[PDB]
Amino acid sequence: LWKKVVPPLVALGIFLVIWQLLCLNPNFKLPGPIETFSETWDPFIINPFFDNGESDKGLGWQILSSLGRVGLGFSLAAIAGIILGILIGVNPLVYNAVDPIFQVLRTVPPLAWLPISLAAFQQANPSAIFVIFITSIWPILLNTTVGVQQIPQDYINVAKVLRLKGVKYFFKIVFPATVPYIFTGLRIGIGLSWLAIVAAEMLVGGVGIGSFIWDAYNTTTETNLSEIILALIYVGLVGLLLDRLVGFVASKV
Amino acid sequence: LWKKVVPPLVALGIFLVIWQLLCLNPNFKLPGPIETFSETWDPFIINPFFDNGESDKGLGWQILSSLGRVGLGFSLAAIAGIILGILIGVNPLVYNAVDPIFQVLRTVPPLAWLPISLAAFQQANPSAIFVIFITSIWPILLNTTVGVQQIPQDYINVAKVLRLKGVKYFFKIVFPATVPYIFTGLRIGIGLSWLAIVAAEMLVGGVGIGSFIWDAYNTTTETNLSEIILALIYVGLVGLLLDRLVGFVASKV
Amino acid sequence: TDNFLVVEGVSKIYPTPEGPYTVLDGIDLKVREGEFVCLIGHSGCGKSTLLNMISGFNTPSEGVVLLQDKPITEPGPDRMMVFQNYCLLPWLNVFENVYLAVDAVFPNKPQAEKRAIVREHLAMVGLTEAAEKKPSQISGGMKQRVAIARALSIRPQVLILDEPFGALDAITKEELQEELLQIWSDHQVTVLMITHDIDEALFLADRVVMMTNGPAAQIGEILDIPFDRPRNRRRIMEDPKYYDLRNYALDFLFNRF
Amino acid sequence: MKKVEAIIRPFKLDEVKIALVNAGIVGMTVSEVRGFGRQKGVEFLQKLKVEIVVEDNQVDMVVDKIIAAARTGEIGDGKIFISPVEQVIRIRTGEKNTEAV
Amino acid sequence: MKKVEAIIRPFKLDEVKIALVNAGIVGMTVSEVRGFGREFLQKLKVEIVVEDNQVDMVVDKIIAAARTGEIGDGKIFISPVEQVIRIRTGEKN
Amino acid sequence: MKKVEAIIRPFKLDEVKIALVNAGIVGMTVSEVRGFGRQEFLQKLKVEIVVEDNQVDMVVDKIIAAARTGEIGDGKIFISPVEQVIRIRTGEKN
Amino acid sequence: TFVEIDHVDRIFDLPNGGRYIALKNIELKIKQGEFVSLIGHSGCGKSTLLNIIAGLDRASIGGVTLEGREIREPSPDRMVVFQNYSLLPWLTVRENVALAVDEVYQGKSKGERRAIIEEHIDMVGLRLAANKRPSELSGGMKQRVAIARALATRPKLLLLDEPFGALDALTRGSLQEQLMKICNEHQITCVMVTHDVDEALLLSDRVVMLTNGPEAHIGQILEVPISRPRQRLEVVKHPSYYNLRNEIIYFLNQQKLAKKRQTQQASAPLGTAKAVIEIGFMPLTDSAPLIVAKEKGFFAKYGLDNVILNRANNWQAIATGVVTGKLDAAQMVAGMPIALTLGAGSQTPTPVINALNLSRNANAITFSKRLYNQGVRSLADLKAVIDSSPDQILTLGVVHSASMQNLILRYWLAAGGIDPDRDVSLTVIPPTQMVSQLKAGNIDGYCAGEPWNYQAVHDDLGFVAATALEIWSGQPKKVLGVREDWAQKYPETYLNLVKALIEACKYCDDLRNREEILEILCRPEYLDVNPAYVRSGFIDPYDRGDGTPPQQLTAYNQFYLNKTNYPNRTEILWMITQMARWGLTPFPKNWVEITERVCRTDIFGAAARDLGLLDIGEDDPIHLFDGKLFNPSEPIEYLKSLEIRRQIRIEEVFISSG
Ligand SMILES: Nc1ncnc2c1ncn2[C@@H]1O[C@H](COP(=O)(O)OP(=O)(O)O)[C@@H](O)[C@H]1O
Ligand SMILES: Nc1ncnc2c1ncn2[C@@H]1O[C@H](COP(=O)(O)OP(=O)(O)O)[C@@H](O)[C@H]1O
Ligand SMILES: Nc1ncnc2c1ncn2[C@@H]1O[C@H](COP(=O)(O)OP(=O)(O)O)[C@@H](O)[C@H]1O
Ligand SMILES: Nc1ncnc2c1ncn2[C@@H]1O[C@H](COP(=O)(O)OP(=O)(O)O)[C@@H](O)[C@H]1O
Ligand SMILES: Nc1ncnc2c1ncn2[C@@H]1O[C@H](COP(=O)(O)OP(=O)(O)O)[C@@H](O)[C@H]1O
């Protein structure tokens, strides 16, 4: 324990001092550790669930505001390769007839859908959810459609020697053989999904993380940057939890 | 050819055909494929470099301006990714002393650096490069450092019975062994860099692929949506070629 | 028994864009019921293809193989097979692994009776103690143990055995060979093991056949093992007739070919 | 009337005389020499040439005491050359062959 | 076992060791001395122990190593040795 | 032929020069030893003289006479045997 | 000499200070042009031993030495061929071979190094596939590059860490055949490590078969006498090649069989809490270590509390007491423990382990005055006297039937051309009253201990004639024997019993303290004699009593000096080849296992390092007056080279675990 906890905490101390001593330079106009955490301690740390009433609550509500959107969203995308992925692959004729299209659609940058998403949907709340669904769907089914094409030939033979075919073949040979790959797609998908939500709110406004950073940044004030860097810590830290917990689920199966 | 090239071309027709008939339906008020190329064939499709002034150039210039930033960027990251990536990993102590920090820093999405990147650098141009540089080293660094410590023990020992210890060790055993891992790191680094450049402009504006799609949404005209979709497809292609470019050099080495 | 599994001049010709290869040519084998035929031969002599052909995974393209006068054309539970990589599903535990074979071959059998069949076909191989560990958490030798136990869960007629002992250490083989031999004289199922180690075949065989290597492989010099059926490992090696056989087989694999 | 000469490790001293003094031997003539043998480094090593004269009765016992004390386990621990002496003379009195010490 | 002991000039060390390393005799103790001869020199004292047969072979090599005619080059003392006990093993003779 | 290997105090070195040369055999070998008898370690010197066997008595008495001190740490004299010595300059059996 | 593996004792460190000892006292000298193969059952240290030779690992004690200069780091003079393929996938086979030569031969430029790669890639036969990539190549010849690369640098001690074990048997062959041509064509030495017997014994020159389990060590250096020019299909037909293969197979089987027994022994019920430990002894000054261990409280110092010394009257009582469980840990003669483990006399073999041999060189074969006046003064004189005529054929005497008194005495008589059981008679007689036996005239000679032999000298009833020192100056006389049953039970109270005696031996070995021990050995409860009877040979010059001045025997009662305290196998095995020589027992066919079972050196090793003592027992060639150079790796050959013996009969002796 002492050989894996002590080292990283040393890095912060080195990082803090290196981060410090950069305030003395007037050109390097960024907040320092001594004060970036000081004034932000009261309004945004001790009371995460501080509610004012108009798109100006505490960080906890802001984080849970967007976390809900990626939760309510991305569940339609969650069962995209789970359903649509397996339908492809088991049909070699169509797999080669959709691969080029999905490869091009997959690499289209997220948040490039937003301009037309707001065109299709007049509202904004059911627009920052669609962007998540359409951006996270591709890494899930593409990484699920690859498993059906790469189930080991060993498991095919053990199924052919027996008269295993039809439905009985799917739920005992094929589908369990893609679960180890589905959770590779979800690990990539969830992380990529988190990217869209954070950036998406920055262009549609309203409650939710991301819009908090732009809202504070645009409204220049005495210590606007003090909480933006703190907001950077949360968004970075929160994403780690989402990425790692999904891996934990994959650990069970 | 007829089994892998012809099929997808058919997929376009069926996909386009179903996309049609949505114009008559009030919902999904998007431009129809029949007229998407109606008002865009003359001024934009035919002329890539349709230069007319400032912030009004043709799509050709926008791609180069945006793609250029990913050129100058992602090279100060590739240089700083490979270098400083081997330095970590050879020493287990330092790796475990900084590994958790990169894990957290590797997850903060693009467009979360940009609000603070602009603060440090007042000019707009030297801010898209920084966000790209800082959001692209992480995928490269993690894939390079892991490769160093996944060198099989077989190659280390055969490099020990032969007294290869020294500079020759790092150019005949270590570096050639991690080249496969670097290109795995560059596989997602190049794509992730493109993921931010397109979204690193529509907030700060300026010439490039971004602020062409975004500004079109703000200003409603008879061709705004058609040009957004036409731009929305070029981002997909350039992303594919840019990512697939690293997929060709990987085969050679 | 007179006309059990027979191979009548089978010969497979691969595409080989450069021309023909004819990996097999003019094979004539007559396996009798309750034998232990062995196909010891060089690597890349088509021996694996030969069993991979009667097993139903290939088509002769020149002849037919008759099992009781019924030509073999598709894989089935009758010609239950045992692969070299243990062909074991890493998800199901050892118990559920065997139950997979029984279920796929006895679908209408009452539930909780198959549970008995798999359980009773797990003590003849000495594996009932570990009936919950997953394959990834079991020893390599024991991993191969549940591949004939699964293959013996069914009631097969011919139990084709691709080289199973390709990774077991020199100590586990001695224990495993006796266990495999012991259960052979319980069901009397024809078995067509592929074995490289010559000394293994002589101890464990009834009629070992060596096929000439090269492009046009042919069965040649079908030996016969006259040692007493209750084989004693240490009573035959010192016997002054296992010498005249082993060194003769070495004269047909290294000297000639 | 026998003369032990035990080449030992450079630092193993302070473990030889502490143990050897318990054997009734009080006189020692330790020295310093440079050694070269089967040990690796960089070409010549440093060893102490402990030099003792003992009675024939305890020659086999003094050597045992040094072996236990000076042993290390790794090679390069030295040797013990036992050589004879005919007319050992102590200039305090010029006595006979007997050590008288 | 018999002892061979020689006195050679200080700079001749890498002429008997070289002549002895390839002669299949590994092992030797060299210590400084201050001879008189014929104020005090700074000679060297090479000391080896070998079996009876090897004395003739080794002694010839030593004399052939530092062989330069100049008065004051030392001699080759040889003494008997009853036992040669190792330390690592404790064996005898 | 006897390897007289006496141990003497450092201060009694120059005195034996007259006795050593007067004895007829002057050449010898000298060294330093951290002697240890009654008296911790204290520096001494060890003198090796390969005197002829027939004149061993004539040399031992001289050394003690010039090395007589009385106080502790007086020293000792050893007499080790040799079977034949050779001259490296010439190489003649002796 | 060339590469010689000095005593290497690699200790492995484990959590909680496990100190799992992998190897202990592995002595092995390899000449030039040798192909030693380190066959051994899995579990022992084979790769560990090879890694030490390769230099990739550091030996805890001692270390291999090449050409008389230790190796401490890996170098391109002792190449290896790892079990795993270990080829650089991103380099062609020519470049893979070029890796070694381009680095080692830095003094040779291009052109003069192209030939080296080209020819080396050709001798191994990997000619056609010279531009392929390791991925393309099949597993078969993917291990040929490793051999080709190793031979490219022209090394001096090319090692083979089971290079081709993953390959099937057919490819296992046809690769040895390639490796045979290299050995015959070139002049290369090696140290191979293989698991298959046929691998070795076929291209090797001297098989070194290791033991099994913790504290491993070479058990039998089998030698393969086949003309070096070899063909895989011509050596097989050698008349005596299959005979050797059954020797290795038989040995490896014993380790398999006698390793589950070791596991079974450990997992057995523990013993109770013994209140008093009864120890049996016999009245002899040589038994001082046991007596002084009590009177001086050495047992108490180690917390053994009460211990009762049940003095015996005849040597048969000790044998009966320990086997029947009445006593336990009774100091007993050197050779009977190996006699009870084999049942010398058709009795039930009851294991009796030996761990703390605790005396040596304390026997004197004294004769009666009748021979003295007749003219007998040595072995030669007696031989002529008996040849004159039967004349009441002389009947010698021995303390016990099977021990190092009825064996060495017979050897001394046998070497003189006299048959012990035909030309003379050996009658077992208790030493207690054997002093009166000579006066009666029933016998004429002795092989008893110190105190009783001097009785004839003092009473002028005989002369010592021979002595242990002038017959064999390592002669064991006493050993601590405990039933193997009473070793898994009571793991403690044995090491503390072993430790207590070691200190007792040390205390009684110094010449200064021996005077005090003299009084202790003159009490009714112990050896009861006038103090001026045991003085001779203990603290007084020995009186041979043959018209010669007394000679001070410096080491005639060794207890600690000269490394007496060690149950070395090499000399216990010499007893088996002498009990069998006289027909007292069939020569065991599995001596390699019984010997390491009777001599429990594991206990002593733990009782020496903790206490502080030279645990590494000497390699003990059994050197008698006429050294015949006993070789402790082929006893049958030694037993077949003796002029006088009984019909040799070899069979496997089976002993129940308990
Ligand atoms: N796709 C293929 N095209 C041409 N030849 C093939 C193909 N697959 C296998 N072969 C040939 O079939 C031959 C028989 O292989 P076989 O001896 O059965 O393998 P094994 O040595 O594992 O038993 C091989 O020598 C190989 O060259
Ligand atoms: N023949 C020799 N004569 C005198 N000293 C020797 C001789 N051989 C070895 N030594 C001394 O023993 C020391 C260790 O040498 P070596 O024998 O190689 O190691 P070890 O004693 O452990 O076997 C050296 O420092 C050397 O001075
Ligand atoms: N009695 C002696 N015992 C030991 N060494 C001696 C003795 N006399 C001279 N030597 C050594 O021999 C060396 C003289 O060598 P050399 O010149 O050949 O003989 P000399 O000096 O008698 O002509 C001196 O340096 C000295 O160290
Ligand atoms: N037995 C011995 N072994 C080695 N050196 C001895 C021995 N006896 C005397 N010496 C040497 O002689 C000296 C003896 O000193 P000490 O015991 O005070 O008596 P003394 O006054 O006669 O010198 C020591 O310095 C020692 O080096
Ligand atoms: N890291 C380690 N810690 C403790 N013991 C080890 C370690 N590595 C190897 N060993 C011990 O060394 C012995 C030999 O190991 P190995 O070389 O793998 O098998 P073998 O020697 O039979 O080829 C094993 O019994 C094992 O307990």
Coordinates of N, CA and C in Angstrom, one line a residue, chain G residues 30-122:
Chain G
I30 N 33.3 -29.9 -15.0 CA 33.0 -30.1 -16.4 C 34.4 -29.9 -17.1
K31 N 34.8 -30.9 -17.9 CA 36.0 -30.8 -18.7 C 35.7 -30.1 -20.0
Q32 N 36.7 -29.8 -20.8 CA 36.5 -29.3 -22.2 C 35.9 -30.4 -23.1
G33 N 35.1 -30.0 -24.1 CA 34.5 -30.9 -24.9 C 33.6 -31.9 -24.2
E34 N 32.8 -31.4 -23.3 CA 31.8 -32.2 -22.5 C 30.4 -31.7 -22.8
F35 N 29.4 -32.6 -22.6 CA 28.0 -32.3 -22.9 C 27.2 -32.7 -21.7
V36 N 27.6 -32.3 -20.5 CA 26.8 -32.7 -19.3 C 25.4 -32.3 -19.5
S37 N 24.5 -33.3 -19.2 CA 23.0 -33.1 -19.3 C 22.4 -33.2 -17.9
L38 N 21.7 -32.2 -17.4 CA 21.2 -32.1 -16.1 C 19.7 -32.6 -16.0
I39 N 19.6 -33.9 -16.3 CA 18.3 -34.5 -16.1 C 17.9 -34.3 -14.6
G40 N 16.6 -34.2 -14.4 CA 16.0 -34.1 -13.1 C 14.5 -33.9 -13.0
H41 N 13.9 -34.5 -12.0 CA 12.5 -34.4 -11.9 C 12.1 -33.0 -11.6
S42 N 11.0 -32.5 -12.2 CA 10.5 -31.2 -12.0 C 10.3 -30.9 -10.6
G43 N 10.6 -29.7 -10.1 CA 10.5 -29.3 -8.7 C 11.9 -29.0 -8.2
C44 N 12.9 -29.7 -8.5 CA 14.3 -29.4 -8.1 C 14.8 -28.2 -9.0
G45 N 15.9 -27.7 -8.6 CA 16.5 -26.6 -9.3 C 17.3 -27.0 -10.5
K46 N 16.7 -26.9 -11.7 CA 17.4 -27.1 -12.9 C 17.7 -25.8 -13.7
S47 N 16.6 -25.0 -13.9 CA 16.8 -23.7 -14.5 C 17.5 -22.8 -13.6
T48 N 17.3 -22.9 -12.3 CA 18.0 -22.1 -11.3 C 19.5 -22.4 -11.4
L49 N 19.8 -23.7 -11.5 CA 21.3 -24.1 -11.6 C 21.8 -23.6 -13.0
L50 N 21.1 -23.7 -14.0 CA 21.5 -23.2 -15.3 C 21.6 -21.7 -15.4
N51 N 20.7 -21.0 -14.8 CA 20.7 -19.5 -14.7 C 22.0 -19.1 -14.0
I52 N 22.4 -19.8 -12.9 CA 23.6 -19.5 -12.2 C 24.8 -19.7 -13.1
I53 N 24.8 -20.8 -13.9 CA 25.9 -21.0 -14.8 C 25.9 -19.9 -15.9
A54 N 24.7 -19.6 -16.4 CA 24.5 -18.6 -17.4 C 24.9 -17.2 -16.9
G55 N 24.8 -17.0 -15.6 CA 25.2 -15.8 -15.0 C 24.0 -14.8 -14.8
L56 N 22.8 -15.2 -15.3 CA 21.6 -14.3 -15.2 C 21.2 -14.2 -13.7
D57 N 21.7 -15.1 -12.8 CA 21.3 -15.1 -11.4 C 22.6 -15.2 -10.6
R58 N 22.5 -14.7 -9.4 CA 23.6 -14.6 -8.5 C 23.5 -15.8 -7.4
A59 N 24.5 -16.6 -7.3 CA 24.5 -17.6 -6.3 C 24.7 -17.1 -4.9
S60 N 23.9 -17.5 -4.0 CA 23.9 -17.0 -2.6 C 25.3 -17.4 -2.0
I61 N 25.7 -18.6 -2.2 CA 27.0 -19.1 -1.6 C 27.8 -19.7 -2.7
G62 N 29.1 -19.5 -2.7 CA 30.0 -20.0 -3.7 C 29.6 -19.4 -5.1
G63 N 29.9 -20.2 -6.1 CA 29.6 -19.8 -7.5 C 30.4 -20.5 -8.5
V64 N 29.7 -20.7 -9.7 CA 30.4 -21.3 -10.8 C 31.7 -20.5 -11.2
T65 N 32.7 -21.2 -11.7 CA 33.9 -20.6 -12.2 C 34.3 -21.2 -13.5
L66 N 34.6 -20.3 -14.5 CA 35.0 -20.7 -15.8 C 36.5 -20.4 -16.0
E67 N 37.3 -21.4 -16.4 CA 38.7 -21.3 -16.7 C 39.4 -20.7 -15.4
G68 N 38.9 -21.0 -14.2 CA 39.6 -20.5 -13.0 C 39.3 -19.1 -12.7
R69 N 38.3 -18.5 -13.3 CA 37.9 -17.1 -13.0 C 36.4 -17.0 -12.9
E70 N 35.9 -16.5 -11.7 CA 34.5 -16.5 -11.5 C 33.8 -15.7 -12.6
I71 N 32.5 -16.1 -12.8 CA 31.6 -15.3 -13.6 C 30.5 -14.7 -12.7
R72 N 30.4 -13.3 -12.8 CA 29.4 -12.6 -11.9 C 28.3 -11.9 -12.7
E73 N 28.5 -11.7 -14.0 CA 27.5 -11.1 -14.9 C 27.4 -11.9 -16.2
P74 N 26.3 -11.8 -16.9 CA 26.2 -12.5 -18.2 C 27.2 -11.8 -19.2
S75 N 27.7 -12.7 -20.1 CA 28.7 -12.2 -21.1 C 28.5 -13.1 -22.3
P76 N 29.0 -12.6 -23.5 CA 28.9 -13.5 -24.7 C 30.0 -14.5 -24.8
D77 N 30.3 -15.2 -23.7 CA 31.1 -16.4 -23.6 C 30.4 -17.6 -23.2
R78 N 29.2 -17.5 -22.5 CA 28.4 -18.6 -22.1 C 27.0 -18.2 -22.6
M79 N 26.7 -18.6 -23.9 CA 25.4 -18.3 -24.5 C 24.4 -19.2 -23.9
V80 N 23.1 -19.0 -24.2 CA 22.0 -19.8 -23.7 C 21.0 -19.9 -24.8
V81 N 20.1 -20.9 -24.7 CA 19.0 -21.1 -25.6 C 17.7 -21.3 -24.7
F82 N 17.0 -20.2 -24.6 CA 15.9 -20.2 -23.6 C 14.8 -21.2 -24.0
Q83 N 14.0 -21.6 -23.0 CA 12.9 -22.5 -23.3 C 11.9 -21.8 -24.2
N84 N 11.5 -20.6 -24.0 CA 10.7 -19.8 -24.9 C 11.6 -19.5 -26.1
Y85 N 10.9 -19.3 -27.3 CA 11.6 -19.1 -28.5 C 12.6 -18.0 -28.5
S86 N 12.1 -16.8 -28.0 CA 13.0 -15.6 -27.8 C 13.7 -15.2 -29.1
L87 N 13.0 -14.9 -30.1 CA 13.5 -14.3 -31.4 C 12.9 -13.0 -31.6
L88 N 13.7 -12.0 -32.1 CA 13.2 -10.7 -32.4 C 12.3 -10.8 -33.7
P89 N 11.0 -10.6 -33.5 CA 10.1 -10.8 -34.7 C 10.4 -9.8 -35.8
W90 N 10.8 -8.6 -35.5 CA 11.0 -7.6 -36.5 C 12.3 -7.7 -37.2
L91 N 13.0 -8.8 -37.2 CA 14.3 -9.0 -37.9 C 14.2 -10.4 -38.6
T92 N 14.8 -10.4 -39.8 CA 14.9 -11.6 -40.6 C 15.9 -12.6 -39.9
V93 N 15.8 -13.9 -40.2 CA 16.7 -14.9 -39.6 C 18.2 -14.5 -39.8
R94 N 18.5 -14.0 -41.0 CA 19.9 -13.6 -41.2 C 20.2 -12.4 -40.3
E95 N 19.3 -11.5 -40.1 CA 19.6 -10.4 -39.2 C 19.5 -10.8 -37.7
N96 N 18.6 -11.8 -37.4 CA 18.6 -12.3 -36.1 C 20.0 -13.0 -35.7
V97 N 20.5 -13.7 -36.6 CA 21.9 -14.3 -36.4 C 22.9 -13.1 -36.4
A98 N 22.7 -12.1 -37.3 CA 23.6 -11.0 -37.3 C 23.6 -10.2 -36.1
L99 N 22.6 -10.3 -35.2 CA 22.5 -9.5 -34.0 C 23.7 -9.9 -33.1
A100 N 24.0 -11.2 -32.9 CA 25.0 -11.7 -32.0 C 26.4 -11.3 -32.6
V101 N 26.6 -11.6 -33.9 CA 28.0 -11.5 -34.4 C 28.3 -10.0 -34.6
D102 N 27.4 -9.2 -35.0 CA 27.6 -7.7 -35.2 C 28.0 -7.1 -33.8
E103 N 27.6 -7.6 -32.7 CA 27.9 -7.1 -31.4 C 29.2 -7.7 -30.8
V104 N 29.4 -9.0 -30.9 CA 30.5 -9.6 -30.3 C 31.8 -9.3 -31.2
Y105 N 31.7 -9.6 -32.5 CA 32.9 -9.4 -33.3 C 32.9 -7.9 -33.8
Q106 N 33.1 -7.0 -32.9 CA 33.2 -5.6 -33.2 C 34.5 -5.3 -33.9
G107 N 35.5 -6.1 -33.7 CA 36.8 -5.9 -34.3 C 36.9 -6.4 -35.8
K108 N 35.8 -6.9 -36.4 CA 35.8 -7.3 -37.7 C 34.8 -6.5 -38.5
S109 N 35.2 -6.0 -39.7 CA 34.3 -5.1 -40.5 C 33.4 -6.0 -41.4
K110 N 32.6 -5.3 -42.2 CA 31.7 -6.1 -43.1 C 32.6 -6.8 -44.1
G111 N 32.0 -7.9 -44.7 CA 32.7 -8.8 -45.6 C 33.4 -10.0 -44.9
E112 N 34.2 -9.7 -43.9 CA 34.8 -10.8 -43.1 C 33.8 -11.3 -42.0
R113 N 32.6 -10.6 -41.8 CA 31.6 -11.1 -41.0 C 30.4 -11.6 -41.7
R114 N 30.3 -11.3 -43.0 CA 29.2 -11.9 -43.8 C 29.4 -13.4 -44.0
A115 N 30.6 -13.8 -44.1 CA 30.9 -15.2 -44.2 C 30.5 -16.0 -42.9
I116 N 30.7 -15.3 -41.7 CA 30.4 -16.0 -40.5 C 28.9 -16.3 -40.4
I117 N 28.0 -15.3 -40.7 CA 26.6 -15.5 -40.7 C 26.2 -16.5 -41.8
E118 N 26.8 -16.4 -43.0 CA 26.3 -17.3 -44.0 C 26.6 -18.7 -43.7
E119 N 27.8 -19.0 -43.2 CA 28.2 -20.4 -42.9 C 27.5 -21.0 -41.7
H120 N 27.3 -20.2 -40.7 CA 26.6 -20.6 -39.5 C 25.2 -21.0 -39.8
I121 N 24.5 -20.1 -40.5 CA 23.1 -20.4 -40.9 C 23.0 -21.7 -41.8
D122 N 24.2 -22.2 -42.3 CA 24.2 -23.3 -43.2 C 24.4 -24.6 -42.5

